[PDB]
């Protein structure tokens, strides 16, 4: 691609500058270029990749919701549908790009739990964003792809990580949200968030001050959803 | 939306 | 361009949807397409054009300042300079696009004071944004182009508009900022803001409730700068 | 910056 001529280290440096500048489309392009160098990503680099695309797709999701809401009010010219479709297609393209990077070849080469769970959670997340805008037949298959990715990530995280591990906690939070918002399974969402919270609570005594802060932050997010849902 | 993890 | 096949009315409708969705790059592209239909813009349409590009260039200016600050700290690899240059070039391209639209042919066909002052103020604004990132020789010519556009707008607004007219007030505010921030003329900036404020104050008695609200809002902005500067 | 008119 267009980043083929830039050094990997220069791409990472520019991704960090783009983050500071809140230039998230640039940041995503830089991190895509870094992934396409073919080497594995460090922990910091994985988080830069995720920050970049989370912000890009987050803007698209917010825009899609505004337009879909106007479109649905409009049905109580073709322009609202056309423009919603344009944004939807762009959103789908970003999700497909992220899923492509994970499939070529980040997940395949990810052997450690911290990297493999991170990437499989991302795969679940971006199928979930596809599911948010999907409708018929495709929606069922997209939902199952999200579920499968989250489930593999869950299986690894329960075998290989402590219950306070922030990657494990964030995965459980998002899988629970998948159950509630996508899969029409609020009871599974609640059960997963509660069991996750309770098992982390019992492990907090093992944690340093800084690890305690990181784990309790995500535990509070789990609690926030449980409060909303119960 | 807005229920998921707000960072990576 | 790419909007050549879309109806003018559809472009305007989509610009409004893009605004609601905070998709300002789309909004700017739609309004550019509308301008390129060749017809004059209504008051509402002029404001859509300006909102769109103000938000696009505003993001670029904020990013450029972050990167320029990091670059200057860095000088107390080439990557910071390269990326700052990339953003700067993109910023310059947006400003050139806006100036191109004003020159082809919005200003030429603008005969009423409300439209001509609006466009000439915009021309001053976007030369001013070019001046913010300009350095040598070019900076002098860009500054003079900004000054000339603002000065013509000022001459028309003092002849044709009341001193409380919000277009006139906003032009005076921005020309005063030009004097302070660009032209190294803080005393002219202060004199212009004070005289503008005082002459509007004396005309407020003529205004309806809604016109009073609009004019006093911009008068407060003038006061805010005067307080900062004195 | 941030001294100019915050709308068109
Ligand atoms: Cl469209
Ligand atoms: Cl660059
Ligand atoms: Mg190399
Ligand atoms: Mg579609
Ligand atoms: Mg029940
Ligand atoms: Mg037509
Ligand atoms: Mg340059
Ligand atoms: Mg003095």
């Amino acid at each position: 691609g267009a980043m083929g001529s830039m050094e990997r280290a220069s791409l990472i440096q520019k991704a960090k500058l783009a983050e500071q500048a809140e230039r998230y489309e640039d940041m995503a392009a830089f991190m895509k270029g870094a992934v396409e160098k073919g080497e594995e990503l460090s922990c910091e680099e994985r988080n830069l990749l995720s920050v970049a695309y989370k912000n890009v797709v987050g803007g698209q999701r917010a825009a899609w919701r505004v337009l879909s809401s106007i479109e649905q009010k409009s049905n109580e010219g073709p322009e609202v549908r056309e423009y919603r479709e344009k944004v939807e297609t762009e959103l789908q393209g970003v999700c497909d790009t992220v899923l492509g990077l994970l499939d070529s070849h980040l997940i395949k080469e990810a052997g450690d739990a911290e990297s493999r769970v991170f990437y499989l959670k991302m795969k679940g997340d971006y199928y979930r964003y596809l599911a948010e805008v999907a409708t018929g037949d495709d929606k069922k298959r997209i939902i199952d792809s999200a579920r499968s990715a989250y489930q593999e990530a869950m299986d690894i995280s329960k075998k290989e990580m402590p219950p306070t591990n922030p990657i494990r906690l964030g995965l459980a939070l998002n899988f629970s949200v998948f159950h509630y918002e996508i899969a029409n399974s609020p009871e599974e969402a609640i059960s997963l968030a509660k069991t996750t919270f309770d098992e982390a609570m019992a492990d907090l005594h093992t944690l340093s001050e800084d690890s305690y802060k990181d784990s309790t932050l995500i535990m509070q997010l789990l609690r926030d959803n449980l409060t909303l849902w119960t | 939306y807005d229920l998921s993890l707000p960072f990576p």
Side-chain angles (χ1 to χ4, degrees), chain A residues 1-72 74 77-113 115-136 142-158 160-193 195-212 214-230, chain B:
Chain A
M3 305 295 175
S5 63
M6 205 185 309
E7 290 275 15
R8 188 185 191 280
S10 296
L11 291 163
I12 297 296
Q13 188 182 349
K14 292 184 183 173
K16 293 179 187 164
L17 297 166
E19 189 187 14
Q20 296 292 310
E22 296 185 7
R23 294 267 297 192
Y24 295 108
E25 293 200 3
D26 287 350
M27 192 187 181
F30 291 140
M31 287 313 298
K32 179 177 190 277
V35 169
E36 291 174 342
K37 300 295 171 183
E39 313 180 52
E40 295 186 24
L41 301 192
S42 71
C43 179
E44 182 182 18
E45 290 162 358
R46 295 195 289 279
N47 283 274
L48 289 170
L49 174 72
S50 176
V51 164
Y53 279 107
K54 183 184 242 302
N55 275 276
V56 171
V57 78
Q60 294 172 319
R61 291 162 79 207
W64 182 93
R65 292 194 294 271
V66 167
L67 296 172
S68 293
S69 163
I70 293 168
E71 183 185 14
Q72 283 174 270
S74 97
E79 287 87 358
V80 179
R81 177 194 48 85
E82 289 170 350
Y83 186 44
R84 189 269 301 159
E85 283 176 349
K86 175 194 183 159
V87 170
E88 184 175 300
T89 298
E90 190 191 281
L91 181 38
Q92 289 168 329
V94 166
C95 288
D96 289 346
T97 292
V98 172
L99 291 167
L101 296 169
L102 297 168
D103 200 49
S104 178
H105 293 85
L106 291 168
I107 289 169
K108 178 176 201 327
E109 298 294 348
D112 295 351
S115 61
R116 188 163 188 91
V117 172
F118 185 97
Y119 291 135
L120 287 166
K121 176 190 157 291
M122 276 191 88
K123 185 176 181 172
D125 288 341
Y126 282 83
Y127 273 113
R128 173 160 61 79
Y129 307 149
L130 288 174
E132 288 179 337
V133 306
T135 55
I142 293 162
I143 287 170
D144 200 57
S145 292
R147 185 187 316 268
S148 182
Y150 283 135
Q151 188 63 62
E152 181 176 358
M154 289 286 329
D155 294 345
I156 297 166
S157 69
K158 286 173 132 184
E160 305 293 349
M161 293 162 163
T164 49
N165 179 281
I167 303 167
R168 179 169 165 181
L169 290 176
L171 160 68
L173 176 77
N174 279 13
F175 196 17
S176 164
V177 167
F178 166 82
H179 288 308
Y180 192 91
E181 295 196 321
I182 305 292
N184 194 33
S185 299
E187 290 177 335
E188 186 75 12
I190 292 164
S191 181
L192 176 52
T195 287
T196 301
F197 182 99
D198 290 346
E199 282 164 26
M201 178 67 60
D203 192 59
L204 291 177
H205 74 274
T206 68
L207 297 187
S208 78
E209 274 296 314
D210 281 57
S211 291
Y212 186 84
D214 295 336
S215 301
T216 57
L217 184 150
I218 304 175
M219 289 173 65
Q220 183 62 56
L221 299 174
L222 290 160
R223 175 58 50 192
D224 289 341
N225 289 354
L226 283 167
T227 292
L228 191 58
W229 297 339
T230 60
Chain B
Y1 62 99
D2 282 339
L3 297 192
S4 61
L5 196 66
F7 44 84

